[PDB]
DNA sequence: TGAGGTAGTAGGTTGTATAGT
DNA sequence: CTATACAACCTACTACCTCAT
């Protein structure tokens, strides 16, 4: 009978340096970490897109309840929640028209149809941002359904809608839109006409196609908390994080396009205590491995990344961090790490940590309907442990993984550290996701966003973008 | 002297607001008396409200919800402020907190219908400002705010009922450890007897081709019916590698490393499993990665095992609990079992299209809760077992792999009261 | 919340080495 | 060059997990 230690749940700290466990409650109770002058919201949507968005801004001022407000906290309303106004009176609109939508949308190719509406929005956004004397804190892209429906690979507009035959015989619109807008940094928050106005989108039966009555309070929390983060201030910070750590999350994406199938973009995302995050964009190499089904780096690029992270940290924090954890889902080749070692200052401790959600040690509580509460961990080796970032959470009285939860193996592949701090720091790092405001995420924010980030690297590759904060990459 | 801000509220209808107002207020400096903070146990408990309303309550806040006006307890709570409204002889002693978008005048109690509207309807924040700004206009007492107080309460009171508690609880794994491994692992320079082009997975034993040598836990003698003219191999000739060494890593051969060896056992273990289910009473669901095994309808009496219900019905489709075997060497070699829900319209004929299955599985899954998922799986392992302590996986006639039916148990102090 | 998309993981299908003409 | 004896992909298929949230 092995024994499970327990990791006390990390506390994220909100206004007045008062800390608790649920951002939803932490913000609702005290508000954001840095209260901000009111958000000025630009809209890049159909004249309808404005009314819906306006429906939301107006809607969220008032409280909005979830189905059960223990499992999902209610949303007091934006002003009560964030102590500032995200006013619908104050919108700064750049219109798009069906004529624009129809004209661009219809092209036979998905890609020529995608890449150009993407181009359309940016000029509309870019023109507003660069040109405006008037300033908008966030640009919200209100995507008519007609865009969402058809701007993805594998979605086939009938041959009976296409005005022009394809000129010749990536493609996800929103990510691209973030990617193109990447070189000039602007915060893009993308919304779907359907989500904002979901009861105004009935199906043939006349019931709404997607019905959110259960989680409507929740949506606002996710949107605002993200909207809040883009507009300036972070909602919250990790409460008791020992000074001077660096969490670095290694992100790659395979570039399918290259004839040689090793062409995968590379990144590292730097998190300290806030999760505002900094995304260090690495340039494109032969990272993917055919034999190994793995991602990896040559030292010379690898040295630039750690350094790019270390130096920016220093420009940021006036010293080199005394502890650096590099997380990734893969083991580290000794040569790859040794590249990392060499760049690193002498007394800084560099830890590589492989967080792999392989399907192991599904643990079933003996008694009761509910599963093992989250924070239980089993420690395999001084090096290797299993962490439950998912599982029943009593503040919620709900389980976080809605099935029996799957713990994540954590191994300090390279470097030496106390596994107990590792589990701790990772349990902490699930608390930092500004964009999806939940009690905690399954994955630490280091590697949580890689799959989304990965598209963004590749979708824009000409660019050599400076290291940037998350809101830009969100 | 009187400092308090008593909040009269309906529960649980205005609980979300009442809790928000008090905590926000308490944090702001105010002293708030609300039922929400306490856990009263006394006859006076009505009295406590009355004494507090009677004497120390500077302001009476009442939740102006439809429920609040029609509530017996609140209406009783209300009774005093009016009784005590005069004594104060302050007009603004009672404050309707109109939090409800939908109050007919008819609902509103007459006493407070008259009164001024503290509008939490349009926004909660404006209402707080309005409630507070009204507090400025009349000098309602305050302390410098310490939100520390605000969430000491929230953390201590509201969160009191459910939090991590030092409790003891054991959890059953889905890793059922292998018990016994064949004393040696041997490699046969099968050579001429060996044909590369043949497939051995109709060889009724775990066999895989590594290099030019032959790999398995079956002694060389084991394959006859399907491998002729191999009475020609010296007993001596094949390598005979200590298994009890390999897990250790005691065996590293520059020709082949333990990592290589460790990977190898696993196809066998899984294969060993795959065969045994060939003859262990369960029809197998095939997923591309590996097979899933679900007992057919009626195999177990009334479709239940050991009191567990491993076959059932959903809609027009029967569901059949099924399982898979991952075998993993490390940290401790074990059989890993992931659980499945197969689907049949009729008791033994499998459903054609996954999409119906994927829908079935998600729809069916919602019913089973941690308690249910564990019992069915353990029983299913319990079901397979060919003996009291373990399952039997047959590599070879004299060589067998034994895996405990009951998975590893982890005991942790620290758990939560079941709601 | 849930209809989606992702991420494991095997493999059989497949594209490269070897080898003999 | 062209047989194949193999290597290393690529592909369903499924359990999770996310978002144009
Ligand atoms: Mg988002």
């Amino acid at each position: 009978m092995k024994e499970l230690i327990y990791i006390e749940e990390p506390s994220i700290l909100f206004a007045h340096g008062q800390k608790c466990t649920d951002p939803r409650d932490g913000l609702a109770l005290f508000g954001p970490l840095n209260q901000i002058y009111g958000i000025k919201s630009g809209v890049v949507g159909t004249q309808k897109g404005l009314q819906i968005f306006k429906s939301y801004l107006d809607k969220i001022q008032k409280p909005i309840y979830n189905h059960n407000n223990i499992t999902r906290p209610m949303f007091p309303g934006f002003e009560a929640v964030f102590g500032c106004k995200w006013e619908s009176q104050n919108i700064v609109f750049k219109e798009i028209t069906d004529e624009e939508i129809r004209r661009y949308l219809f092209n036979a190719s998905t890609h020529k149809r995608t890449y150009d509406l993407v181009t359309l929005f940016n000029d509309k956004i870019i023109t507003a941002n660069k040109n405006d004397e008037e300033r908008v804190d966030v640009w919200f892209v209100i995507v008519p359904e007609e865009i969402y429906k058809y701007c993805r690979p594998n979605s086939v507009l009938p041959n009976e809608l296409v005005q022009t035959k394809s000129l010749i015989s990536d493609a996800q619109f929103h990510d691209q839109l973030k990617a193109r807008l990447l070189e000039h940094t602007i915060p893009t928050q993308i919304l779907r006409e359907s989500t904002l106005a979901w009861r105004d989108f009935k199906n043939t039966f006349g019931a709404p196609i997607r019905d959110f009555s259960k989680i409507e309070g929740h949506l606002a929390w996710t949107i605002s908390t993200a909207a809040y983060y883009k507009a300036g201030g972070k909602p919250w910070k990790l409460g008791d994080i020992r000074p001077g750590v660096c969490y670095l999350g290694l992100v790659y994406k395979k570039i399918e396009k290259s004839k040689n199938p090793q062409n995968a973009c590379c990144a590292a995302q730097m998190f300290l205590d806030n999760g505002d995050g900094t995304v260090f964009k690495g340039e494109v190499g032969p990272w993917y491995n055919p034999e190994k089904g793995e991602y990896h780096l040559k030292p010379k690029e690898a040295k630039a990344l750690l350094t790019q992270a270390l130096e920016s940290y220093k420009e940021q924090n006036k010293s080199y961090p005394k502890e650096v954890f590099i997380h990734a889902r893969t083991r580290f080749n000794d040569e790859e790490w040794n590249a990392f070692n060499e760049v690193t200052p002498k007394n800084t401790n560099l830890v590589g940590v492989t967080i792999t959600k392989s399907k192991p040690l599904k643990l079933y509580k003996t008694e009761g309907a509910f599963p093992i509460m989250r924070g239980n961990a089993y420690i395999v080796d001084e090096k290797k442990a299993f962490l439950w970032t998912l599982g029943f959470v009593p503040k919620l009285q709900s389980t976080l993984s809605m099935e029996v939860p799957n713990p994540i193996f954590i191994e300090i592949n390279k470097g030496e550290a106390e596994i107990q701090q590792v589990l701790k720091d990772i349990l902490a790092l699930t608390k930092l996701n500004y964009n999806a405001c939940i009690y905690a995420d399954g994955e630490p924010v280091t590697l949580r966003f890689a799959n989304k980030i990965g598209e963004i690297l590749t979708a824009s590759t000409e660019i050599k973008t400076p290291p940037l904060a998350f809101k830009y990459y969100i | 002297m009187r400092n308090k801000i008593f909040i009269s509220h309906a529960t649980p209808e205005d609980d979300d607001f009442t809790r928000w107002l008090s905590l926000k207020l308490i944090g702001l400096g105010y002293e708030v008396w609300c039922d929400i903070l306490f856990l009263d146990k006394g006859v006076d408990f009505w009295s406590t409200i009355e004494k507090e309303i009677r004497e120390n309550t500077c302001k009476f806040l009442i939740v102006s919800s439809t429920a609040g006006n029609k509530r017996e307890g609140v209406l009783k709570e209300l009774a005093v402020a009016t009784k005590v409204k005069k004594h104060l002889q302050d007009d603004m002693f009672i404050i309707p907190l109109a939090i409800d978008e939908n109050l007919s005048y008819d609902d509103i109690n007459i006493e407070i219908v008259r009164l001024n509207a503290i509008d939490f309807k349009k926004s909660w924040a404006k209402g707080l400002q309005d409630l507070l700004d009204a507090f400025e206009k009349q000098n309602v007492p305050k302390k410098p705010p310490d939100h520390s107080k605000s969430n000491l309460l929230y953390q201590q009171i509201f969160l009191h009922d459910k939090q991590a508690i030092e409790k003891e609880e054991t959890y059953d794994s889905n890793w059922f450890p292998i018990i016994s491994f064949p004393n040696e692992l041997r490699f046969h320079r099968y050579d001429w007897r060996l044909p590369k082009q043949f497939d051995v997975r109709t060889l009724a034993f775990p066999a895989i081709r590594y290099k030019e040598y032959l790999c398995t836990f079956a002694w060389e003698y084991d394959f006859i019916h399907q491998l002729p003219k191999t009475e020609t191999y010296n007993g001596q000739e094949s390598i005979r590698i200590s298994t009890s060494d390999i897990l250790s890593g005691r065996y590293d051969t520059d020709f082949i490393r333990n990592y290589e060896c460790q990977r190898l056992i696993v196809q066998l273990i899984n294969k060993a499993f795959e065969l045994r289910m060939k003859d262990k009473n369960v029809r197998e669901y095939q997923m591309s990665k590996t097979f899933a095994y679900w007992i057919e309808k009626g195999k177990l009496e009334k479709d239940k095992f050991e009191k567990i219900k491993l076959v059932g019905k959903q809609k027009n489709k029967y569901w059949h609990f099924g399982i898979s075997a991952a075998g993993k060497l490390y940290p401790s070699p074990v059989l890993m079992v992931s659980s499945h829900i197969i689907f049949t319209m009729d008791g033994i004929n499998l459903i054609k299209s996954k999409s119906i299955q994927h829908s079935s599985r998600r729809k069916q899954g919602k019913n089973w809760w941690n308690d249910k998922w564990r019992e069915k799986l353990l029983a299913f392992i319990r079901f397979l077992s060919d003996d009291q302590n373990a399952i039997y996986l047959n590599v070879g006639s004299e060589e067998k792999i034994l895996i405990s039916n009951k998975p590893l148990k982890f005991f942790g102090k620290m758990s939560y009261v079941t709601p």
Side-chain angles (χ1 to χ4, degrees), chain A residues 1-358 360-474, chain B residues 1-113 115-159 163-164 169-192 194-288 290-365 367-408 410 412-419:
Chain A
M1 214 182 205
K2 270 297 177 213
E3 158 174 330
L4 306 196
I5 52 139
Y6 174 85
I7 285 147
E8 269 242 318
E9 181 67 24
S11 37
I12 62 190
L13 102 73
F14 314 95
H16 306 115
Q18 250 303 287
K19 25 151 121 109
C20 67
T21 312
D22 200 298
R24 313 178 273 178
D25 280 3
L27 290 115
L29 252 196
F30 322 132
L33 189 141
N34 22 22
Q35 250 122 350
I36 77 186
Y37 324 128
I39 309 190
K40 203 154 216 230
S41 35
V43 199
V44 189
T46 38
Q47 258 222 286
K48 173 130 144 239
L50 238 348
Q51 220 187 343
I52 300 190
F53 181 66
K54 266 185 243 178
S55 273
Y56 227 46
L57 285 195
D58 298 34
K59 221 225 249 194
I60 69 182
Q61 286 264 99
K62 296 191 180 194
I64 36 176
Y65 298 52
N66 302 184
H67 179 60
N68 134 300
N69 320 254
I70 285 147
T71 64
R72 290 170 196 313
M74 65 133 293
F75 188 99
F78 195 101
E79 185 148 28
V81 176
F82 301 76
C84 104
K85 7 77 147 259
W86 185 18
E87 283 181 317
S88 34
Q89 93 152 349
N90 175 98
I91 293 167
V92 176
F93 190 178
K94 234 290 187 192
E95 179 191 57
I96 275 166
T97 24
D98 315 63
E99 280 101 56
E100 318 224 351
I101 297 188
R102 297 144 185 223
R103 167 151 65 246
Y104 305 109
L105 167 54
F106 281 122
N107 167 299
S109 152
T110 279
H111 294 31
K112 206 191 166 207
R113 142 176 67 211
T114 278
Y115 164 104
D116 272 283
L117 301 151
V118 172
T119 315
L120 157 40
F121 282 99
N122 318 13
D123 236 81
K124 291 274 155 230
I125 303 183
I126 294 197
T127 29
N129 169 268
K130 177 164 196 31
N131 252 34
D132 201 66
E133 66 307 1
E134 300 257 281
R135 293 315 272 190
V136 201
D137 292 49
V138 168
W139 266 121
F140 304 51
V141 177
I142 327 322
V143 165
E145 173 106 66
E146 22 196 31
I147 317 191
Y148 164 72
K149 205 42 212 162
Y150 288 106
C151 298
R152 308 200 303 314
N154 194 65
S155 90
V156 278
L157 171 133
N159 305 284
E160 308 88 314
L161 305 168
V162 177
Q163 300 308 237
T164 6
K165 285 36 141 210
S166 173
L167 305 201
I168 192 183
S169 290
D170 188 45
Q172 219 140 274
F173 164 97
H174 49 251
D175 313 274
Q176 244 209 278
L177 201 176
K178 274 156 213 164
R180 191 117 69 245
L181 255 149
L182 224 278
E183 78 204 273
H184 14 229
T185 58
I186 295 150
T188 67
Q189 225 218 307
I190 285 193
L191 305 185
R192 227 247 302 284
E193 231 155 44
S194 93
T195 352
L196 312 184
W198 62 272
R199 39 207 335 131
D200 284 313
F201 273 54
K202 319 256 177 126
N203 69 5
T204 44
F205 277 174
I209 307 192
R210 293 182 183 174
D211 165 272
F212 289 141
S213 53
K214 271 164 124 60
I215 84 195
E216 220 197 341
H218 171 32
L219 273 68
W221 267 123
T222 298
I223 318 197
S224 338
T225 313
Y228 190 83
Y229 173 39
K230 271 150 204 283
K234 29 235 242 109
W236 70 77
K237 240 174 172 95
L238 268 188
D240 299 357
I241 190 73
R242 334 97 63 161
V245 201
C246 204
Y247 303 96
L248 243 353
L250 298 182
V251 167
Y252 307 87
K253 196 90 234 120
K254 184 195 152 164
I255 299 259
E256 330 247 35
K257 286 223 314 332
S258 168
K259 293 195 281 130
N260 155 298
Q262 250 182 330
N263 249 24
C265 211
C266 151
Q269 30 214 336
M270 198 201 56
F271 292 98
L272 304 147
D273 58 334
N274 48 19
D276 183 12
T278 284
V279 194
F280 295 108
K281 185 186 126 293
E283 284 293 68
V284 201
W287 311 145
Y288 206 177
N289 167 298
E291 284 115 51
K292 262 38 165 231
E294 215 168 279
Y295 268 110
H296 284 319
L297 258 183
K298 266 144 69 168
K300 229 49 195 325
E301 185 118 320
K303 312 209 152 131
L305 223 45
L306 221 267
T307 354
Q308 210 182 160
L310 300 190
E311 282 299 312
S312 182
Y313 176 92
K314 202 206 158 266
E315 262 191 328
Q316 247 173 284
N317 311 238
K318 285 39 218 208
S319 347
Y320 281 94
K322 277 269 203 311
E323 266 199 286
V324 181
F325 302 70
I326 281 170
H327 307 163
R329 348 206 102 178
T330 52
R331 313 185 221 40
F332 298 85
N333 66 116
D334 239 335
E335 164 266 33
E336 160 178 14
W337 218 73
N338 284 35
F340 280 147
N341 234 343
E342 237 98 65
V343 203
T344 303
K346 349 188 116 151
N347 54 46
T348 286
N349 183 34
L350 191 62
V351 197
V353 201
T354 271
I355 294 175
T356 180
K357 295 180 182 297
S358 254
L361 241 217
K362 215 126 83 197
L363 259 210
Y364 299 109
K365 204 188 43 136
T366 352
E367 244 203 278
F370 287 105
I372 25 151
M373 63 167 314
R374 144 212 171 81
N376 275 280
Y378 161 42
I379 312 201
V380 197
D381 296 344
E382 295 205 57
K383 257 47 172 180
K384 16 222 167 173
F386 275 92
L387 185 56
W388 267 266
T389 43
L390 255 9
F392 178 95
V393 162
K395 183 241 160 292
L396 290 162
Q397 281 291 308
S398 178
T399 165
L400 284 177
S401 169
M402 271 73 75
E403 227 163 35
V404 200
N406 266 277
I408 44 186
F409 210 147
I410 298 156
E411 215 221 330
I412 332 191
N413 199 204
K414 309 275 174 215
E416 174 214 57
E418 182 177 314
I419 173 70
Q420 289 236 0
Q421 193 62 36
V422 168
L423 294 187
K424 280 199 160 174
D425 295 3
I426 284 188
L427 208 69
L429 283 163
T430 75
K431 280 273 180 333
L432 297 175
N433 175 4
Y434 291 136
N435 273 280
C437 169
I438 39 160
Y439 184 91
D441 224 296
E443 274 152 301
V445 72
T446 51
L447 337 144
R448 152 84 165 95
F449 282 115
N451 289 337
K452 191 202 243 174
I453 275 188
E455 294 262 311
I456 324 196
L457 303 164
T458 298
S460 196
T461 352
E462 155 155 61
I463 32 39
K464 299 259 268 292
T465 17
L468 311 113
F470 254 26
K471 25 188 217 145
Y472 304 136
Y473 287 48
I474 294 169
Chain B
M1 258 115 145
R2 46 286 152 256
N3 40 342
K4 269 167 205 173
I5 282 207
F6 174 75
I7 289 205
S8 178
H9 57 82
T11 49
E13 7 257 341
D14 300 336
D15 271 7
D16 289 290
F17 178 71
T18 346
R19 159 185 298 134
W20 188 88
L21 183 71
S22 15
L23 282 209
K24 264 266 169 151
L25 285 207
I26 297 188
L28 276 173
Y30 293 95
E31 212 105 68
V32 173
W33 205 98
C34 186
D35 314 17
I36 276 280
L37 331 318
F38 312 77
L39 60 113
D40 216 336
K41 191 214 44 180
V43 303
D44 52 281
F45 62 142
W46 180 10
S47 205
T48 29
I49 300 155
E50 250 183 76
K51 250 209 194 238
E52 304 271 14
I53 332 190
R54 199 141 165 45
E55 283 229 90
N56 245 51
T57 306
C58 180
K59 249 41 152 202
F60 191 97
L61 300 203
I62 174 181
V63 157
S64 210
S65 56
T66 298
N69 304 288
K70 258 115 159 161
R71 210 125 198 110
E72 175 140 10
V74 180
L75 292 157
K76 237 87 235 145
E77 251 180 40
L78 218 187
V80 184
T82 41
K83 240 264 169 251
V84 193
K85 196 179 199 321
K86 166 78 137 198
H87 236 211
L88 128 139
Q89 227 181 320
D90 163 10
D91 309 307
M92 271 66 136
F93 181 69
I94 299 191
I95 298 167
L97 314 171
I99 62 157
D100 196 350
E101 278 95 35
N102 286 322
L103 229 50
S104 344
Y105 197 142
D106 228 26
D107 325 280
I108 288 197
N109 190 255
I110 166 128
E111 300 276 346
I112 80 192
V113 171
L115 296 150
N116 205 3
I118 186 81
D119 211 83
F120 284 160
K121 283 118 55 210
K122 291 248 161 155
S123 168
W124 274 13
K126 198 67 174 32
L128 236 239
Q129 155 92 359
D130 270 12
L131 191 73
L132 316 169
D133 226 288
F135 284 158
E136 157 169 314
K137 288 232 158 104
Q138 14 249 132
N139 261 144
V140 190
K142 159 180 216 175
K143 290 136 49 186
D146 202 18
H147 297 260
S148 205
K149 202 190 183 318
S150 184
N151 79 301
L152 158 67
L153 273 36
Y154 148 42
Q155 292 142 257
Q156 272 276 277
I157 318 266
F158 298 12
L159 263 229
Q163 225 319 328
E169 201 134 46
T170 75
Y171 327 110
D172 286 3
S173 158
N174 71 321
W175 281 5
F176 296 95
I178 306 316
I179 294 169
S180 65
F181 256 117
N183 292 338
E184 321 168 36
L185 162 60
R186 56 224 74 75
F187 294 165
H188 313 308
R189 238 110 66 145
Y190 246 43
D191 266 341
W192 86 37
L194 93 75
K196 19 192 47 50
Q197 112 80 87
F198 190 23
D199 182 337
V200 320
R201 299 155 307 126
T202 324
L203 255 286
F205 285 120
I208 38 255
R209 5 291 262 58
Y210 178 49
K211 183 178 179 180
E212 307 312 75
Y213 312 51
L214 210 325
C215 181
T216 193
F217 296 87
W219 274 75
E220 47 285 50
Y221 343 81
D222 304 323
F223 321 66
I224 276 31
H225 147 133
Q226 303 169 341
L227 214 174
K229 269 167 175 169
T230 326
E231 331 165 49
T232 81
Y233 185 61
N234 305 137
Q236 303 64 317
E237 184 139 334
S238 252
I239 340 199
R240 291 192 181 180
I241 308 182
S242 189
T243 36
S244 35
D245 298 24
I246 325 324
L247 60 67
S248 238
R250 288 262 159 161
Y251 166 107
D252 171 299
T253 42
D254 290 89
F255 112 63
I256 62 100
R257 220 131 325 140
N258 199 342
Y259 76 74
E260 206 51 87
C261 206
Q262 306 222 308
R263 160 153 48 268
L264 294 171
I265 297 179
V266 185
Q267 314 63 327
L268 315 173
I269 291 194
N270 307 240
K271 190 42 169 194
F273 210 77
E274 257 190 335
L275 292 182
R276 191 128 180 61
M277 298 299 135
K278 204 141 205 195
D279 191 275
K280 203 33 239 212
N281 246 14
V282 304
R283 192 82 196 146
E284 65 187 8
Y285 191 26
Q286 193 226 337
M287 323 147 262
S288 351
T290 159
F291 296 117
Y293 303 123
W294 66 293
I295 321 177
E296 6 168 3
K297 166 110 149 327
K299 227 72 198 143
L300 302 125
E301 196 199 319
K302 236 102 247 216
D303 303 324
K304 284 190 149 226
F305 172 88
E306 208 144 341
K307 76 168 35 202
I308 308 306
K309 180 177 209 225
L310 300 193
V311 164
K313 200 124 197 191
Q314 167 212 334
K315 200 204 246 204
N316 21 120
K317 329 141 193 305
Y318 310 102
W319 63 259
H320 315 237
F321 186 95
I323 81 165
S324 46
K328 204 195 206 192
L329 296 309
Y330 184 82
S332 282
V334 305
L335 188 76
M336 303 181 160
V337 200
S338 266
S339 323
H340 301 39
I341 301 182
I342 329 295
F343 275 114
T344 10
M345 26 156 109
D346 52 51
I348 37 127
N349 264 334
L350 331 328
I351 296 299
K352 188 173 211 168
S353 223
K354 321 75 174 233
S355 161
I356 335 119
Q357 292 231 270
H358 306 147
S359 83
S360 147
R361 160 42 144 92
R362 239 50 66 183
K363 235 169 46 83
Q364 174 42 219
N367 293 347
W368 306 355
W369 283 157
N370 173 114
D371 58 348
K372 269 104 151 286
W373 251 41
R374 167 208 128 241
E375 62 186 30
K376 320 243 191 256
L377 166 90
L378 275 84
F380 202 121
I381 297 313
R382 293 182 183 174
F383 164 107
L384 310 163
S385 359
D386 301 32
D387 88 47
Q388 338 143 40
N389 35 341
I391 301 198
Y392 284 174
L393 298 125
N394 284 327
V395 275
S397 87
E398 278 235 30
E399 293 304 6
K400 264 193 232 237
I401 299 167
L402 268 62
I403 22 208
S404 156
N405 61 18
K406 277 282 240 121
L408 324 67
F410 303 55
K413 327 141 148 159
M414 287 297 218
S415 219
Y416 49 95
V417 300
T418 187

